[PDB]
Structure formats: C-alpha cells, structure tokens
C-alpha cells in the first residue's frame, strides 16, 4: 500500500518544492476521460515509502509488481478520496545522486492486457557441469518481454541450469511460458543464457 496526495495544477518549475518537502511527483496513466474526468492523474508520493519499494523490488524488478495506491488529503490524513490498483512503469532518477524524480504508473485492473519486461532468474547454477569444469553462466538478456493479464503477472522467470555444460545456449524458445501470458515480438532464436569460459578477451 502506498499513500498519495492530491495536487493543484502548477508549472514544471514547482516540482522541486515537492521534493524538498519530501514527496516525489507521480503520474497514473490509463483512464477514460468520459467516465473518470481525466485521462491521467497527477499526485505525489512520500519519498520514504518510494525508496522502500525500490529497495525491496528494484528499479526494473518493481515493474512486474502490482501495488495498491490510497489517495488522501494532505491537510487531513483521515480523508480518503479512493483506492486504485496500479503497476509501476518507469522511474526517473538523477545520474549523479541516484534520487527519485518522477514515477510513472499504469492503471491495471484485473482484466486488462499489459506488456511487462520480466527479469530472468537462475536456479541451481552452482551445481552444473560447466561451472564445475571452470566455466560460468553469462546472461545476455536480463529482461524479456511478455504480454500478461492483470490477474497473472509473473514476478520473474525461473530458468534451471542444473544440466548445462560448456557452450550450452538457452534461447527464447526454451523459456517457460506461464499460464495467462505469451511471448512478445518475433525475434526468437535469440541467446538468453550462455555457459562459456570467455571473459571478453580483456
């Protein structure tokens, strides 16, 4: 659960005053203007909660998670406007200090189709013929694109490498496809994992 506050219509130059106070601007996309009044919603989220979410999940890992947002009045914390079900999309972060600047979220009901870049995870990498011989498992694509339903978003893809030897390559065709999701794109036969001994010839 995340807490958000309503905002007034202001210029871009007024955003730094919110960060100084301790809140990060956020935008929620994907509403119908006819029935809701806006196509997008502007709010601000406390930095303390925002940092915890990123640390717990990660900058890219949190994009495959579903969160609950509660909108309340800044002056009176007990006034609740409503609740929303959303998933993070992207994060704007300073390069020199690694501080949050802007959060993009998508309105994600349980019956909507969304495109998610799911991270790839490895299991039983220590117990592998290639590792024992002296090789290592190199990941060429950290994230892979999927089309998932709102009710079923895979937190991550589990690829087992317990039976991989040297020069073994795992392509997109071999990745698991959980229920309620399908692979995106047409560039199949792309290397995702590679058990090798090369270290870049450095």
């Amino acid at each position: 659960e995340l807490t958000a506050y309503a905002r007034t219509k202001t210029k871009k130059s007024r955003a730094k005053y919110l960060r100084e106070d301790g809140n990060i601007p956020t935008v929620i996309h994907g509403f119908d203007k006819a029935t809701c009044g806006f196509h997008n919603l502007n709010l601000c989220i406390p930095e303390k909660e925002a940092n915890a979410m990123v640390r717990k999940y990660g900058r890219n890992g949190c994009a495959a998670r579903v969160v609950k947002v509660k909108v309340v009045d800044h002056a009176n914390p007990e006034k609740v406007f409503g609740y929303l079900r959303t998933r993070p999309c992207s994060l704007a972060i300073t390069a020199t200090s690694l501080k949050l600047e802007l959060m993009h979220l998508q309105y994600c009901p349980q019956d909507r189709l969304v495109d998610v870049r799911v991270p790839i995870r490895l299991i039983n990498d220590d117990v592998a013929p290639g590792v024992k011989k002296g090789g290592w498992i190199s990941v060429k694509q950290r994230l892979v694109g999927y089309q998932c339903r709102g009710n079923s978003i895979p937190p991550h893809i589990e690829v087992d490498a317990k039976h991989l030897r040297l020069d073994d390559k795992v392509l997109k065709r071999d990745l698991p496809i959980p229920k309620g999701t399908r692979l995106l794109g047409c560039d199949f036969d792309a290397v995702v994992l590679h058990c090798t001994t090369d270290v870049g010839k450095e």
């Binding site: 990660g58 900058r59 890219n60 890992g61 992207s90 704007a92 972060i93 300073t94 390069a95 020199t96 200090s97 690694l98 600047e101 290592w136 190199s138 950290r142 270290v199 870049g200 450095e202």
Partner: protein, 166 residues
C-alpha cells in the same frame, strides 16, 4: 527568450536543425577501435559539463563505477587505472571499458614566444560528464567491486560512486 528577428521567425535558412554538441543530452556511443586522428582540435571539444540523462543504467554487467563530477582524463591515466583494475579484480573477471581517449592536445616546447601558429599533438584526452558510468564488472561479488572502487579512487581527480543493477 530567443534572439531572432521577425523575418527570421518566418524565412530562416537553417532548415536542418542540430543541437550543438556542447549542450546535447544524448548519451555518448560505445568506444570503437578506429585509429587516432592526426587533425588538431579546439579546446572545447575535450570538455563537456552537462549532466547525463535521468534514465542511465548499467547495460551489460551487474556492478559498475560512475563519476559524480565532470573531468578531463588523459590517456596515461586510463592505462594506469586499467592495470590497477585488472590486477585487483582477477584474471577470471569480465570487464567492460566505456571510455577512450580520442581528442588530441597540442603543446609547444620551452623557449618559444607566443604566435607563429598552433602547436603539434602531444597527447589525447576524453571528456567525462557527471553521473557517467565508466567501468562495468561481471563474474565478481559485491565486496570485490568495492575493493576495485577504493583502489582507483586515489588515482583520479573526481569523486566516484558504485552502481548496481536491480
């Protein structure tokens, strides 16, 4: 405010508009292996202070080192850092180098008065922008990355930080 006249707002001949390199925000490309040029440059080409975009991340590895300040590094400094990193990490480590010295610099010998043209090439440099990522590592642990960071910090004039992929 934009410094132009009314005829210029309507009939400007600058049809193809390119943002000057000094203030362009596009990230620099990956270094190539082309030979160094023998054409003298201007001093501005070796300096760039605009910060990096607010979406920069690691591209290949799990750990890396970034610069918190702008600077101009010579070819000699890069070679010393490369040897230090290679020795410190391991022989069995994956290293990506994201920088290269390509901008020539000139100098004149002692005992020469001002004038009579520009000097000859002496060495090469590369500009560094704030928040830029310099090196990436893989097939190592986090403690090893910290050791590499501490080893090179005394050898550089700018503050350094650690970046992790998540």
């Amino acid at each position: 405010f934009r410094r132009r006249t009314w005829p210029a707002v309507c009939g400007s001949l600058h049809i193809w508009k390119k943002m000057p390199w000094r203030i362009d925000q596009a990230p620099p490309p990956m270094p190539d292996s082309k030979p160094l040029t023998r054409l003298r440059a201007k001093r501005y080409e070796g300096i760039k202070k605009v910060v990096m975009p607010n979406s920069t991340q690691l591209q290949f590895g799990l750990y890396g080192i970034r610069s918190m300040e702008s600077a101009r590094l010579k070819d000699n400094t890069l070679e010393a850092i490369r040897r230090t990193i290679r020795r410190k990490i391991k022989k069995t480590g994956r290293l990506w180098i994201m920088i290269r010295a390509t901008v020539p610099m000139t100098k004149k010998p002692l005992g020469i008065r001002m004038g009579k043209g520009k000097g000859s090439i002496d060495h090469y440099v590369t500009p560094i922008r704030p928040g830029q990522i310099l090196y990436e590592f893989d097939r190592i642990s986090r403690p090893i990355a910290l050791q590499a960071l501490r080893a090179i910090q005394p050898k550089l004039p700018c503050r350094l930080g650690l970046v992790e992929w998540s």
